[PDB]
Design a protein around this ligand. Structure first.
Ligand SMILES: O=c1ccn([C@@H]2O[C@H](COP(=O)(O)OP(=O)(O)O)[C@@H](O)[C@H]2O)c(=O)[nH]1
Length: 453
């Protein structure tokens, strides 16, 4: 009876899909231990998932928190929190190796690492254990990451010099250079975060294979590119397996309020607004959204974080028969699949994008950071299941644009065709997940390959 070791990167978007991956391993007769490397206590992702609650919810998974590593020396004023996180994660590889040596060797099936824990491949390599990266982003994003070394090698300036000039990667929709992850727009030699982030992320292909949280029919060109010898000249990439979509007190009350209210709304009527595990609009922006939402006349369910006075006077009273505003953390997956939900105003994180795709809900795209601006292009231009919200790169989206785009998705003929394409993709997501469907077949091919290694 073998044990898979799951070793996620920090953050809701890395841990939540890994828990779902764990359930797949369990369904296939593996034991699971999920090894948790906590970031620095100053990380916005520090204990953002309540692991005590997660363990209680999944008693068949063994959860193991690694002993802490020193980092105060690195925690200098002004350091980008993600640079500190990348450095801290490299420092955990000693504790990870001590833990892995504590497990009877013959019982180890594989090591599956998050996409910012890739240096742990050296630990599995040394122990003779197959290592896989769990890539929690799109397959197109993986295809970009694989091709970024070649793009950056000849350069004497950062990609910021290109402005909105399109970047072209094999298998990937063109997207403006400015929409690349922002930190990668600096010259690698000029910015430690750029160099470190590229050096870490690029190693997702240095193991035995990659488990991607996507379904092949959503991203067929990107999956083809990853198997194409030109993708990374002079290199054969390991196997890529599309195994998704893998979708997973005060919050308990909020969830109850949300779903009971949605149950009383007409089908496809509600605009849901929810912006990631940690994005927050300014107070001024929240007011602007509220005015556009009210003006649109549509029903809405709006998850609001306190900025990091919110609404016009009387906004809540006037909208009480068509809208519900809740605080801070909403049951997003259950809202998205609710038949009353008709649109999703999103920050375009990949889990959120997959959740909406799998539910058949068209998107109003408001990307903030990470690869969210890339996801926005993939959703609006590649997939065609969302719309842009003008001003998203400028620091303020006007109430006129909020109303215009809510009405476009919810009332216009263009919106109806958009919804129809979203429903088609939902159907494909469901096909991917059916018994003996593509994502089970892919997971089975991964299990065969890992056993044979
Ligand atoms: O109020 C909220 C905000 C976020 N989420 C979940 O938080 C995840 C966010 O992950 P994503 O990759 O979209 O973006 P990130 O937070 O990493 O930027 C998703 O699974 C959402 O369903 C949620 O359930 N309720």
């Amino acid at each position: 009876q073998q044990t898979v070791i799951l070793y996620p990167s920090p953050g809701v978007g890395h841990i939540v899909p890994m828990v779902q991956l764990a359930k797949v391993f369990l369904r296939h007769g593996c034991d699971v231990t999920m090894v948790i490397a906590e970031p620095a206590a100053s990380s916005p992702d520090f204990r953002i998932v309540d692991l005590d609650r997660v363990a209680a919810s999944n008693p068949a998974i063994t959860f193991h928190v690694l002993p802490p590593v020193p980092y105060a020396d690195l925690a200098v004023p002004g350091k980008h929190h993600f640079l500190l996180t990348l450095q801290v994660l490299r420092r955990y590889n000693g504790e990870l190796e001590r833990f892995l040596r504590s497990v009877p060797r013959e019982r180890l099936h594989s090591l599956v690492v998050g996409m910012f824990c890739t240096d742990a491949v050296d630990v599995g390599a040394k122990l003779g254990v197959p290592v896989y990266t769990f890539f929690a982003s799109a397959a197109a994003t993986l295809a970009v990451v694989a091709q970024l070394p070649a793009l950056l090698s000849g350069r004497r300036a950062g990609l910021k010099e290109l402005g909105d000039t399109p970047l072209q990667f094999l298998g990937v929709p063109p997207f403006p250079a400015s929409h690349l992850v922002r930190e990668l727009l600096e010259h690698p030699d000029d910015d430690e975060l750029c160099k470190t982030m590229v050096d870490v992320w690029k190693r997702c292909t240095d193991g035995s294979g990659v488990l991607v949280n996507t379904f092949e029919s959503l991203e067929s060109p990107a999956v083809q590119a990853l198997r194409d010898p030109r993708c990374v000249p002079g290199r054969v990439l390991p196997p890529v397996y599309c195994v998704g979509p893998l979708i997973g007190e005060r919050a308990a009350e909020t969830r109850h309020e949300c779903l009971a209210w949605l149950d009383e709304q007409p089908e496809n009527s509600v605009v849901f607004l929810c912006f990631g595990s940690r994005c927050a609009h300014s107070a001024e922006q929240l007011r602007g959204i509220a005015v556009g939402l009210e003006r649109s006349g549509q029903r809405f369910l709006w998850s609001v974080r306190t900025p990091a006075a919110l609404f016009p006077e009387g906004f809540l009273q006037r909208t009480k028969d068509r809208g519900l505003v809740v605080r801070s953390w909403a049951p997003q997956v259950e809202v998205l699949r609710h038949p009353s939900t008709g649109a999703f105003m999103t920050h375009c994180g990949w889990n959120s994008t997959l959740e909406a795709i799998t539910a058949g809900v068209p998107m109003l795209c408001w990307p903030f950071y990470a690869e969210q601006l890339m996801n926005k292009v993939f959703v609006t231009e590649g997939m065609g299941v969302g719309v842009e919200m003008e001003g998203y790169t400028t620091g303020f989206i006007k109430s006129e644009e909020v109303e215009a785009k809510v009405r476009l998705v919810m009332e216009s003929e263009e919106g109806r065709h958009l919804r129809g394409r979203a429903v088609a993709l939902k159907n494909e997501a469901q096909a991917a997940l059916r018994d003996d469907g593509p994502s089970e077949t892919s997971f089975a091919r991964f299990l065969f390959d890992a056993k044979n290694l």
